[PDB]
Amino acid sequence: PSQMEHAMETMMFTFHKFAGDKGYLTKEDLRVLMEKEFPGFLENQKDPLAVDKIMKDLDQCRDGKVGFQSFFSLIAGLTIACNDYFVVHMKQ
Amino acid sequence: PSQMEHAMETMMFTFHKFAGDKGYLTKEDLRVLMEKEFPGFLENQKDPLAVDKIMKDLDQCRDGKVGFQSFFSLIAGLTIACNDYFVVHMK
Amino acid sequence: PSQMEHAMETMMFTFHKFAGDKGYLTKEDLRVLMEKEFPGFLENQKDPLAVDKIMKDLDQCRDGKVGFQSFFSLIAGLTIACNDYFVVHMK
Amino acid sequence: PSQMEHAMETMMFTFHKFAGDKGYLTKEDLRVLMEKEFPGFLENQKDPLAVDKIMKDLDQCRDGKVGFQSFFSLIAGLTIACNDYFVVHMKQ
Amino acid sequence: PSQMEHAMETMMFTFHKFAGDKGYLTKEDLRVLMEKEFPGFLENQKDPLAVDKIMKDLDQCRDGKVGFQSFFSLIAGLTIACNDYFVVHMKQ
Amino acid sequence: PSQMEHAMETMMFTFHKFAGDKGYLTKEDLRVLMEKEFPGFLENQKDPLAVDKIMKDLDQCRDGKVGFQSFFSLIAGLTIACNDYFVVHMK
Amino acid sequence: PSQMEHAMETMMFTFHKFAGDKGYLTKEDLRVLMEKEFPGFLENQKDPLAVDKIMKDLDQCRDGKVGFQSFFSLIAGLTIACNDYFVVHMK
Amino acid sequence: PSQMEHAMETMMFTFHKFAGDKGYLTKEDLRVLMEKEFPGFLENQKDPLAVDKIMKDLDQCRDGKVGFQSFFSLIAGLTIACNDYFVVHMKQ
């Protein structure tokens, strides 16, 4: 019930929805997740291999499996840059 | 645009709500943020000064100011812990 | 009769609500009691198996059953901790 | 907001109301607290010195000051006996 | 290696020696333990049923099994009374 | 007379060694007792002020004095924890 | 060459001593390393399975193997904590 | 007393020796520390500004003060590379 609890819940559910019962993301689940849930980031940085570069960044164990924790880094990275952009706006 | 983007913004908006024009959180802004956003989290701890230990891990420069990136690491720890509990018990 | 008596009864009624006819709490009844009565208390812990450590301190006989008196010691620890936080910060 | 949170809050506030700014109960605050908040226990056990016996029981430091923790023991004692009585009812 | 570590070790080993692989004391293991390890207390309090009264005190679960924790209470009780006696000596 | 009696005395003698004529331990006597009797126990904790939380649970009267009985509860907690570890891992 | 270099090597040599030819530490090698290098550290904890929580933070890949870099983060946490205690109390 | 305790002690003392009563390293304390305690690393990487590049790396707060924690990163970095080198030797 607070606004933050709702937000954390939606990140958790989001990840589980695309991870299914195995509970990890494969490059292809990652790809479907990003196209559906990170359009904003996908429409702005137009490299054909964005998802391929994120996956190599995210798969520290080099086993093709993205856990919640690694997934969370992605979210962190993008939320912080979104904040940098938001603060730089602040003006008149 | 998306549920994930919307949630990301809620965390961004939540930090500024408590930060105010100054754009940073002091230990008291941090405490109030928790009391209101995570009801009972600080209150039920054994240590009533637990927010001081949290402030300590989050204020690297020891200038008593908590910026967005540091705030984010606190939210990451709580979200991961909540994810671990849910996996173990909510199937 | 009184506000204090009424509150005492709410804790008594709360234990039986989760205990059910059997009159005792198993580790899962304990877990659900917390999830519903103390939202986020177990969920935000670092250890997702913290309820097992709690069950351990509360089930002296190791028969996996938690009676009223034991339940009470858990509530006492939470109420005291909440009192300590309030004294330190709510003046 | 759960039923238990409301209950703990009312025990905390109760104690602070009768303790005032010093944050401890003297025998006389204890006496006023019991007459106001534990009528049920006061009407059933009719010893003229009930409060005097509880105070000696509760003042482990023998300094006439009852802290929240010691106060909580009292509440514990009475809630448990109230539960023993309640379970023994259960019948038909 | 400190003096206290050695002491804790000897209480632990003592208990395990008399508990054997099941890791609990039965009334009879308790009895053998006390006759061997608490002579001082056994020679001073001469009730024929000392061990029977300690066992009922110690078996809170009423299942005839004495765990390390319960055993530790016994040790606590006797060490504290030994200390009370020791301090009362202090004189000249 | 016995190995158990001898060990009991070592704990009794250890308390008075640090207590001195005064017969009680202040927070600093407690700290030094640990540094010397339990090397690394306080030092490796995350919280450098952990002895204050220990003093808090042990000084009920808040008079800054630790008597024998209270000291004993600290030793009981350490001995039980060491027993639990040994049972789980030393067979 | 230097006291600092020599100490660095002692940690490097300590990891391989317990790792053996295999060059990695399993949870049991980790446990024994602590029992011998940090006497009482695991033993006095409340949780007798604390090494499992430590293994968990250190084995990112969940392959039950602890490499040098991960080992180093454990030593860093212990050394920093020991430094904080010494600053607060040893002047 | 174990070998690791002695090693941690020597890193702690080392740092305090060069930090003195203020308990932080200035670029110049860093420079003296490195010339005295990291000869091996100083003789192998011959850039005239090594210490200047480490200091910028280490002063995350940009306040010219190196705390024990930041100092520890340096030690970490160099011990790990020393280990990489050591393992790569292993041969015959």
How many other C-beta atoms are found inside a 10 Å radius of the C-beta of residue H78? 17
CA distance to partner chain C, nearest, from residue G9 (Å): 34
Coil/strand/helix, residue G67: coil
Return phi, psi of residue H2, to 5°. -75, 180
Q: Please report where in the chains the tokens 């106001």 appear, as a residue.
A: D36
DSSP-assigned states of every residue in E70-84: HHHHHHHHHHHHHHH
Q: Which of G36, G72, G82 lies at the smallest CB-CB distance from H76? A: G72
Q: Where are the alpha helices (DSSP H) in F1-91?
A: 3-19, 27-37, 50-58, 68-89
- DSSP designation for H65: -
Cβ neighbors of H90 (< 8 A, separation 6 or more) are none
Return phi, psi of residue F25, to 5°. -110, 135
Cβ neighbors of A85 (< 8 A, separation 6 or more) are none
Q: Which one-letter amino acid corresponds to residue H9?
A: E
DSSP-assigned states of every residue in B40-82: TTTTTSS-TTHHHHHHHHH-TT-SS-B-HHHHHHHHHHHHHHH
Structure tokens at G31: 């446990």
Q: Nearest residue on chain C to G49, judged by CA atoms?
A: C53
Q: Please report where in the chains the tokens 């709510």 appear, as a residue.
A: C90
The CATH number of the domain where E67 resides is what?
1.10.238.10
Return phi, psi of residue G25, to 5°. -110, 135
Longest distance between any two alpha carbons in chain F, whole Å: 43
CA-CA distance, E87 to H38, in Å (whole number)? Answer: 57
Q: Please report where in the chains the tokens 């003592």 appear, as a residue.
A: E14
Q: Which of E2, E12, E72 lies at the smallest CB-CB distance from F76? A: E72
Chain G and chain F touch, per 3+ beta carbon pairs within 8 A: yes
Q: Which of B63, B75, B83 is nearest to B38 (CA)?
A: B75
CA-CA distance, G59 to E45, in Å (whole number)? Answer: 57
Count CA atoms within 13 Å of residue F44 on its CB side.
Answer: 21
Q: Please report where in the chains the tokens 């399975």 appear, as a residue.
A: G49
CA distances from B79 to A7, A65, A68, D9, E86 (A): 10, 20, 10, 28, 55
> Is A76 near chain G, with CB under 8 Å?
no
CA distance to partner chain G, nearest, from residue A61 (Å): 5
Q: Nearest residue on chain H to B60, judged by CA atoms?
A: H61
Structure tokens at E78: 């006797």
CA-CA distance, D7 to C4, in Å (whole number)? Answer: 8
F15: alpha, beta or left? (left if phi > 0; alpha if psi -120 to 50): alpha
- DSSP designation for B25: B
Structure tokens at C37: 């009565």
Contacts of C49 in chain G (CB under 8 A): none
How determined? X-ray
CA-CA distance, F46 to G82, in Å (whole number)? Answer: 8
Contacts of A80 in chain B (CB under 8 A): 68-69, 72
CA-CA distance, E30 to E37, in Å (whole number)? Answer: 10
Q: Which one-letter amino acid corresponds to residue D83?
A: N
Coil/strand/helix, residue G23: coil
CA-CA distance, G1 to F73, in Å (whole number)? Answer: 49
Cβ neighbors of H52 (< 8 A, separation 6 or more) are H27
Q: Please report where in the chains the tokens 């998802």 appear, as a residue.
A: A51
Residues 44-63 of G with CB under 8 A from A: 60-61, 63
Structure tokens at F30: 């407690």
Return phi, psi of residue D13, to 5°. -60, -40
CA-CA distance, F50 to F40, in Å (whole number)? Answer: 13
CA-CA distance, B63 to B61, in Å (whole number)? Answer: 5
Coil/strand/helix, residue E10: helix
Structure tokens at A45: 């940085």
Q: Please report where in the chains the tokens 């023991």 appear, as a residue.
A: D73
> Is B76 near chain C, with CB under 8 Å?
no
Interface test with H, best of G3, G8, G72 (most H CBs within 10 A): G8
End-to-end CA distance of chain G: 29
CA distances from G9 to B19, D2, H35, H79 (A): 46, 56, 18, 8
End-to-end CA distance of chain B: 29
Cβ–Cβ under 8 Å, residues F4 and E11: yes
Torsion of CA F40, F46, F48, F52, to 10 degrees: -100
Q: Is the Cβ pair B1, A39 closer than 8 Å?
A: yes
Q: Which of H49, H46, H73 is nearest to H59 (CA)?
A: H73
The resolution, in Å, is 2.2
CA-CA distance, H58 to H65, in Å (whole number)? Answer: 9
Cβ–Cβ under 8 Å, residues C55 and C26: no
Q: Which of E9, G71, F56 is nearest to B49 (CA)?
A: F56
Q: Which of C52, C55, C49, C85 is nearest to C70 (CA)?
A: C55
Cβ–Cβ under 8 Å, residues E78 and E40: no
Structure tokens at F66: 């630790």
Contacts of A60 in chain G (CB under 8 A): 60-61
CA distances from B18 to B22, B51, B59, C44 (A): 10, 16, 17, 21
The continuous run of DSSP H or E covering G79 comes out as helix G68-89
Our measurement of the distance from residue F45's CA atom to the centroid of its chain's CA atoms, rounded to an integer in Å, reads: 15
Residue A74, burial from CB neighbour count under 10 angstroms (0-12, 13-18, 19+): buried
Q: Please report where in the chains the tokens 């997740």 appear, as a residue.
A: A33
Cβ–Cβ under 8 Å, residues C76 and D8: no
Cβ–Cβ under 8 Å, residues B88 and A21: no
Q: Please report where in the chains the tokens 């100083």 appear, as a residue.
A: H42
> Is H75 near chain G, with CB under 8 Å?
yes
CA distances from C35 to C25, C42, F65 (A): 14, 7, 40
Residues 23-42 of F with CB under 8 A from D: none
CA angle E33, E10, C60 (to 5 degrees): 65
- Chains with 3+ CB–CB pairs under 8 A to G are A, C, F, H
- HEC profile of chain C: CCHHHHHHHHHHHHHHHHHCCCCCECHHHHHHHHHHHCCCCCCCCCCCCHHHHHHHHHCCCCCCCECHHHHHHHHHHHHHHHHHHHHHHCC
Cβ–Cβ under 8 Å, residues E54 and E74: yes
Contacts of A78 in chain B (CB under 8 A): 8
Per the DSSP assignment, residues forming a β-bridge with B24 are none
Cβ neighbors of H23 (< 8 A, separation 6 or more) are G87, H16, H68
How many other C-beta atoms are found inside a 10 Å radius of the C-beta of residue H21? 6
Cβ–Cβ under 8 Å, residues A83 and B12: yes
- Chains with 3+ CB–CB pairs under 8 A to H are B, G
CA distance to partner chain F, nearest, from residue B71 (Å): 21
Q: Which one-letter amino acid corresponds to residue D55?
A: M
Coil/strand/helix, residue H87: helix
Q: Is the Cβ pair G14, H3 closer than 8 Å?
A: yes
Structure tokens at C57: 């301190």
Q: Please report where in the chains the tokens 């192998």 appear, as a residue.
A: H44
Our measurement of the distance from residue B74's CA atom to the centroid of its chain's CA atoms, rounded to an integer in Å, reads: 5
Q: Which of A69, B57, G88, G4 is nearest to H76 (CA)?
A: G4
Q: Which of A61, A55, A67 is nearest to A25 (CA)?
A: A67
CA distance to partner chain C, nearest, from residue B35 (Å): 11
Cβ–Cβ under 8 Å, residues G47 and G53: yes
The continuous run of DSSP H or E covering H64 comes out as none
Structure tokens at G77: 């946490």
DSSP-assigned states of every residue in A19-68: HGGG-SB-HHHHHHHHHHH-HHHHHHS--TTHHHHHHHHH-TTSSS-B-H
Cβ–Cβ under 8 Å, residues C47 and C53: yes
CA distances from A88 to A44, A45, A83, A85 (A): 18, 19, 8, 5
Structure tokens at A16: 């589980």
Cβ–Cβ under 8 Å, residues E30 and E19: no
> Domain span at residue H27?
1-92
Q: Which of H91, B16, G27 is nearest to A83 (CA)?
A: B16
Integer-rounded Cα Rg, in Å, for chain H is 14
E64: alpha, beta or left? (left if phi > 0; alpha if psi -120 to 50): left
Overall domain count for chain F: 1
CA distances from A63 to A21, A22, A28, D15 (A): 18, 14, 14, 58
Q: Which of A23, A12, A1 is nearest to A67 (CA)?
A: A23
CA angle D3, C86, F56 (to 5 degrees): 115
How many other C-beta atoms are found inside a 10 Å radius of the C-beta of residue H41? 19
Sign of CA dihedral G33, G35, G40, G41: positive
Q: Nearest residue on chain G to A59, judged by CA atoms?
A: G61
Count CA atoms within 13 Å of residue A86 on its CB side.
Answer: 16
**Axis-axis angle for helices D68-89, D50-58 (nearest 10):** 120
CA-CA distance, H20 to A65, in Å (whole number)? Answer: 49
Chain H and chain A touch, per 3+ beta carbon pairs within 8 A: no
CA-CA distance, F24 to F29, in Å (whole number)? Answer: 9
Cβ neighbors of C42 (< 8 A, separation 6 or more) are B85, C31, C34, C35, C50, C51
- Chains with 3+ CB–CB pairs under 8 A to C are B, D, E, G
Sign of CA dihedral A8, A10, A14, A17: positive
Q: Which one-letter amino acid corresponds to residue C80?
A: I
Cβ–Cβ under 8 Å, residues D37 and D14: yes
Cβ neighbors of C49 (< 8 A, separation 6 or more) are B88
Structure tokens at G90: 């040893």
